[PDB]
């Protein structure tokens, strides 16, 4: 049974800062990894999709809807980076994976402005 580890646990982000979020996919089960986001703009927990990286070759898929960038660091480590932090990408992130048609989720990472 696969478990995903997001890093870090939280991010209190400065305006304009670049944030890498990384998610290690353990076990050894599935294809790529899907990155998901919950805009702080929504009062009701509405997950929006962000990107999917294939496990096999470097081959991402971004939904149509500058800000993000993603790569597969060596092995099992899927990086999602927000290029410039702002109110737009301010919210909660997590990766997801699909083995034997079962969805798995990492913890959620609150990336929220400065304090």
């Amino acid at each position, epitope marked *: 049974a696969p478990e995903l580890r997001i*890093f870090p646990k939280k991010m*209190d982000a*400065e305006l304009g*800062q*670049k944030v890498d979020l990384v998610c*290690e996919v353990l076990g050894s089960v599935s294809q790529g990894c899907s990155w998901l986001f919950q805009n702080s703009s929504s009062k009701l927990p509405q997950p929006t999709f962000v990107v999917y990286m294939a496990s096999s070759h470097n081959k991402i898929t971004w939904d149509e809807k500058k800000l993000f960038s993603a790569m597969r660091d060596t092995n099992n480590k899927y990086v999602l980076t927000l290029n410039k932090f702002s109110k737009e990408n301010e919210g909660y992130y997590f990766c997801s994976v699909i083995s034997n048609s079962v969805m798995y989720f990492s913890s959620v990472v609150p990336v929220l402005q400065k304090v």
Partner: antibody
Framework: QVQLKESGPGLVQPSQTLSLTCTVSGFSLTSNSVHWVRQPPGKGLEWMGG???????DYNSALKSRLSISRDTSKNQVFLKMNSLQTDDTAIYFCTPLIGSWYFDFWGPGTMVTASS | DIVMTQSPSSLAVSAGERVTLNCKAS??????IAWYQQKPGQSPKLLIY???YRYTGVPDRFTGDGFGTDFTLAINSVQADDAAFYYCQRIYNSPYTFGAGTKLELIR
């Protein structure tokens, strides 16, 4: 690519403050954390504390009151200040980061710091 | 607390034997454990992460077992190079406490 080197005066007069620098390469301080582990001669390893991507610091209760970790992100440097050194503080000090993971897979080589007059 | 207890204090074993080191956490921490190997005068070297995963480069014979409170580093046919200290660490939550280590001595 990933590398850390600990530097600082290798002899501290007792009651003075230890100051070490850890210069880093191969990753950003902005998204990862750097931690200090120390190891007295013949004794085991000891997590001391660390500093996170966003500047948050985290110490271990044993040393909370006399420990101070900061960083200069513009020069890839993380510092360690420790107060009123004694005999029991003589050790090797390692900096070792968490990059994208929650385990310590990369380590600096370590510096000896004797507390003696 | 979360106290980390490693037993035994030290072992004498022979080139080619299986060995088992134990690690006990006063609290439940699922699989949030790391194992390291250290030769005196050297930095620790990560062997095993999240209780059971072997780090890239680490040889076949190093294996890790356990979840909750009791954890096990095992070496299947030990070799002379394995004479070292072995430490477990709690991993995900602060403090990331170290066991007092186990010493692995060899018989020839």
């Amino acid at each position: 690519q990933v590398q850390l080197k600990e530097s600082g005066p290798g002899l501290v007069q007792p009651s003075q403050t230890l100051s070490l620098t850890c210069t880093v390469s191969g990753f950003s301080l902005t998204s990862n954390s750097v931690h200090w582990v120390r190891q007295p001669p013949g004794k085991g390893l000891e997590w001391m504390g660390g500093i996170w991507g966003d500047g948050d610091t985290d110490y271990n209760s044993a040393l909370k009151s006399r420990l101070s970790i900061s960083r200069d992100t513009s020069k890839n440097q993380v510092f360690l200040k420790m107060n009123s050194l004694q005999t029991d503080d003589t050790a090797i000090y390692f900096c070792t980061p968490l990059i994208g993971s929650w385990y310590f897979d990369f380590w600096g080589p370590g510096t000896m710091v004797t507390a003696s007059s | 607390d979360i106290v980390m207890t490693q037993s035994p204090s030290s072992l004498a074993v022979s080139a080619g034997e299986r060995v088992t080191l134990n690690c006990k956490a006063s609290q439940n921490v699922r699989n949030n454990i790391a194992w390291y190997q250290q030769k005196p005068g050297q930095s620790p070297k990560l062997l095993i992460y999240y209780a059971s995963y072997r780090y890239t480069g680490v040889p076949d014979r190093f294996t890790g077992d356990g979840f909750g409170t009791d954890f096990t580093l095992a070496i299947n046919s030990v070799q002379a190079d394995d004479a070292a200290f072995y430490y477990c660490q709690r991993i995900y939550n602060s403090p990331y406490t170290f066991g007092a280590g186990t010493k692995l001595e060899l018989i020839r």
